[PDB]
Ligand binder design. Structure first.
Ligand SMILES: *Cc1cc2c(cc1C)nc1c(=O)[nH]c(=O)nc-1n2C[C@H](O)[C@H](O)[C@H](O)COP(=O)(O)OP(=O)(O)OC[C@H]1O[C@@H](n2cnc3c(N)ncnc32)[C@H](O)[C@@H]1O
Length: 816
């Protein structure tokens, strides 16, 4: 039994690879084939403690945890095979008032999802975990219905499933080489023979880096060491009838679960103390490392062993049977890389799982869906394999991983900042200049200004669930833009040059807006076949046949991958260039933005010569620039595209030419306050693959009646005619000391009816502003709803958008 022909080759028989093989086979894919080096579970999967909780601190990752657990509950009936899924529920513990607030943060974030999650009181916690030291316990965050599973059994069950549905699981069959073919398919080599696969999937655990290099890619991954401790029988545990729920001690930084008649607990020690396999990155995985563990090291986790002994008194008396120390494949930010990989054909990855046991199930069905449908079933850009790039070096990878381990259980504040491995190489000289004058934000490698420091006001990282030190500065920056002229570094934008004979034809089929004529620029969306908003671009037509596409920083390679894929698919004759790192961008915006820039260029900038959305090459003080009259602030202004190495000089001249008009800097926190005022939508908050552009209110950029048959045109017609179920709205609400930021529950008459997608304090009306999705029947101007912020419901009204008109709408009303 050997196929040389396969639809899909899955490399690696960990829980993740096998889960995928199962899903694809069951979904009806023919000739699925998984290749495993040695035996199923041989990597990290066999050693795990198999905690599986419904809890996640993000958003759509909740779906992954959800699908995995629902799957796991079914498998025993489905496959005839036992999986040893224990479901006593999980509790995360709060011992401080800031930790209670974190639980409130998470509740508003979870109340609009089907995941079941509550904040429980001490008395209840003690009812469920009677061996808990209740001295300092203030509250628990409780997910009933989860717990932990046996990773061996899980995977074995999944494999019988896979086989039952037609997959072929071959081992020992290690992949040794990989060769792309001109038609987009792959030759795979193993010691049992060749397979010609239509597509390949890397699921190779801590070998996933090595497998990437067989095809010339550097996967930013590093195996770390993690340890859990297993105790002997404990009378008081044996004595119970019901299993103890799984705990997380957030302050002690360890998880803990019942294990037979004893306990198992696992620290996340400090970034300074943790260990990782940098030697395995430099020289690769030792061959013959299989099914094996590292030597135990209690000493380096002692501080967490102690906290645990005091939180569970019973541990003081018990003995330690065993300590499991094994590797986990981390990516820098702790999340995996799941999806099709940019810049090669038909390569997919499901790699670098901090939490593969809990993610396997959901990721299987997620990837399966993406593979079969050509688009993901819901948005998980946060796992996009190409959120990383050449800036994600081994040195960075190694240092961020360490931080992400050590930070496992620290308090997760909104607008969190982390400093490890920064700055990367992905900066201009502008960094040097502005670093000490602002809080720099990290964005896919770049250092971009969030907010600027004010004299006589605190400048330090000061995280909070409520308003903090940047609140006042952000209001001044907001003022600065409405009253004078602000300068913002927008250099992180994703930038692509498209030319060749089919440039126009390609774009016309990708994007739902008309393609602007040469000299002009518009906003345009790439939709999926089903009509989801895969991306928002701004499209500049620069010379006949030649274009610049601009996108958000988080969408760089994600958008490129899609465009490259469509160009190839329709045999389009074009040349696509990623010029992201070649260029810097400065936004100059506010009423005095013409007056200032005029001083620096012989080009005529009057509203006469130079209209809104036009693009023109010029020189700004002997520095060549591509000037687009646009601004996401919605105030008068330009974006100035230039060489990276000029960004300092250009900045310098601009700021100097603006003394008189009182020019100053502004950053992204302010920007958000401004665009939100103008009812501007933001890709990734107001729309992504979970949204069609009509429910999001992007009707103005969607030309259904343009000739070309662009991706999603028909799905859109069908949606429009079936009538909307929900709509994005703009909401105002008064608050004491907190602003919506998005992902908060919207309530109406005692029930959750939707969610906020983003938000900010509006400094002009002295109230908070949000964007939210609500049911249509409740989307009228004037409608009253409640918005849950940090455990309190605040009333809110829907308003007529926009709250403030753009400068071009204001200007063109002055004539009429
Ligand atoms: C070490 C550890 C990990 C762990 C844990 C506790 C400890 C001490 N507790 C966990 C938990 O409570 N909950 C959870 O969700 N995860 C937990 N983990 C981590 C977990 O083990 C991993 O996240 C997960 O097992 C990763 O699975 P994945 O399928 O991604 O990778 P793998 O299990 O290592 O399997 C990789 C397989 O691919 C094969 N391979 C390697 N090279 C090749 C080649 N060249 N060709 C074909 N196949 C290959 C390997 O043999 C391996 O079996």
């Amino acid at each position: 039994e050997w196929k040389d022909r396969a639809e899909t080759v899955i490399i690696g028989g960990g829980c993740v690879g096998v889960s995928l093989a199962y899903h694809l086979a069951k979904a009806g894919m023919r000739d699925v084939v998984l290749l495993e080096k040695s035996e199923l579970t041989a990597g990290s999967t066999w050693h795990a403690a198999g905690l599986t909780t419904y809890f996640h601190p993000g958003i759509n990752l909740k779906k992954i945890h959800y699908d995995s657990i629902k799957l796991y509950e079914r498998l025993e009936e489905e496959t005839g095979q036992v999986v040893g899924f224990h479901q006593p529920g999980s509790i995360r513990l709060a011992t401080t008032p800031e930790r209670v607030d974190e639980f409130k943060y998470q509740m508003t974030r979870t109340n609009w999802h089907a995941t079941e999650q509550y904040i429980i009181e001490p008395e209840k916690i003690h009812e469920l975990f009677p061996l808990l030291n209740m001295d300092k316990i203030l509250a628990g965050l409780y997910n009933p219905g989860d717990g932990h599973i046996d990773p061996y059994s899980l995977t074995m069950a999944l494999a019988t499933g896979a086989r039952k549905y037609g997959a072929l699981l071959k081992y020992p069959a290690p992949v040794t080489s990989l060769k792309p073919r001109p038609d987009g398919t792959w030759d795979v080599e193993t010691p049992q023979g060749s397979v010609r696969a239509n597509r390949i999937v890397n699921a190779a655990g801590f070998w996933a880096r090595e497998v990437g290099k067989m095809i010339g890619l550097d996967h930013p991954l590093i195996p770390v060491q993690h340890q859990y401790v297993i105790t002997s029988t404990i009378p008081e545990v044996k004595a119970l009838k019901r299993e103890l729920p799984v705990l997380r001690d957030l302050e002690g930084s360890y998880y803990l679960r019942q294990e037979r008649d004893g306990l198992l607990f696992g620290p996340y020690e400090s970034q300074e103390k943790m260990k990782l396999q940098a030697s395995w990155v430099a020289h690769g995985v030792p061959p013959g490392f299989g099914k094996e563990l590292f030597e135990s090291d209690l000493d380096r986790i002692t501080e967490h062993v102690e906290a645990a002994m005091e939180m569970v008194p019973v541990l003081k008396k018990a003995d330690i049977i065993n300590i499991v120390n094994g590797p986990i494949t981390y990516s820098p930010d702790i999340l995996p890389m799941v999806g099709p990989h940019q810049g090669v054909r038909n390569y997919w990855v499901a790699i670098g799982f901090g939490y593969g046991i809990i993610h396997a199930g959901g990721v299987g069905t997620y990837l399966s869906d993406w593979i079969l449908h050509g688009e993901p079933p819901f948005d998980l850009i946060e796992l996009d394999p190409n959120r990383y790039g050449k800036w994600t070096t081994t040195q960075y990878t190694e240092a961020k991983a360490r931080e992400s381990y050590g930070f496992n259980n620290i308090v997760g504040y909104p607008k969190e900042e982390r400093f490890a491995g920064r700055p990367t190489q992905r900066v201009s000289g502008l960094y040097k200049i502005l670093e000490s004058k602002c809080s720099m934000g990290f964005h896919a490698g770049w250092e971009q200004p969030h907010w600027f420091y004010k004299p006589g006001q605190d400048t330090q990282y000061r995280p909070s669930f409520r308003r903090t030190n940047w609140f006042e500065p952000v209001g001044s920056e907001y003022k600065q833009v409405m009253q004078r002229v602000g300068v913002i570094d927008l250099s992180p934008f994703g930038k692509f040059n498209i030319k060749g004979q089919d440039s126009t034809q390609l774009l016309d089929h990708l994007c739902a807006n008309v393609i602007p004529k040469v000299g002009f620029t518009n906003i345009s969306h790439m939709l999926t076949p089903r009509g989801r908003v895969y991306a928002e671009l701004t499209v500049s037509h620069q010379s006949p046949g030649e274009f610049l596409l601009i996108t958000g920083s988080g969408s760089e390679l994600h958008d490129l991958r899609w465009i490259e894929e469509a160009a190839v698919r329709g045999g389009y004759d074009v040349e696509i260039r990623n010029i992201t790192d070649e260029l810097g961008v400065l936004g100059v915006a506010g009423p005095y933005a013409r007056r200032v820039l005029q001083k620096l260029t012989s080009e005529d900038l009057s509203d006469d010569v130079f209209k809104f959305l036009q693009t023109k090459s010029l020189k700004i003080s002997d520095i060549p620039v591509t000037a687009i009259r646009i601004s996401y602030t919605g105030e008068l202004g330009w974006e100035l595209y230039h060489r990276r190495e000029d960004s300092a000089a250009l900045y310098e001249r601009i700021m100097n030419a603006g003394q008189e008009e009182g020019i100053d800097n502004f950053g992204t926190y302010a920007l958000n306050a401004l665009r939100l005022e103008k009812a501007f939508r933001a890709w990734g908050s107001e729309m992504n693959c979970d949204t069609n552009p009509l429910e999001a209110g992007l009707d103005y950029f969607i030309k259904l009646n343009k000739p070309a048959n662009f991706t999603g045109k028909q799905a859109l017609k069908q949606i429009k005619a079936k009538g909307l179920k929900r709509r994005l709205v703009c909401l105002t609400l008064a608050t004491d000391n907190v602003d919506p930021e998005g992902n908060e529950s919207v309530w109406y008459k005692g029930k959750v009816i939707g969610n906020t997608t983003s938000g900010s304090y509006s400094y002009s009306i002295q109230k908070s502003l949000a964007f939210a999705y609500v049911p249509v029947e409740l989307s009228e101007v004037g409608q009253q709803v409640e918005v849950e912020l940090l455990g309190k419901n605040y009333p809110a009204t829907i308003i007529q958008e926009p709250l403030v008109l753009t400068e071009p709408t204001r200007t063109r009303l002055q004539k009429d």
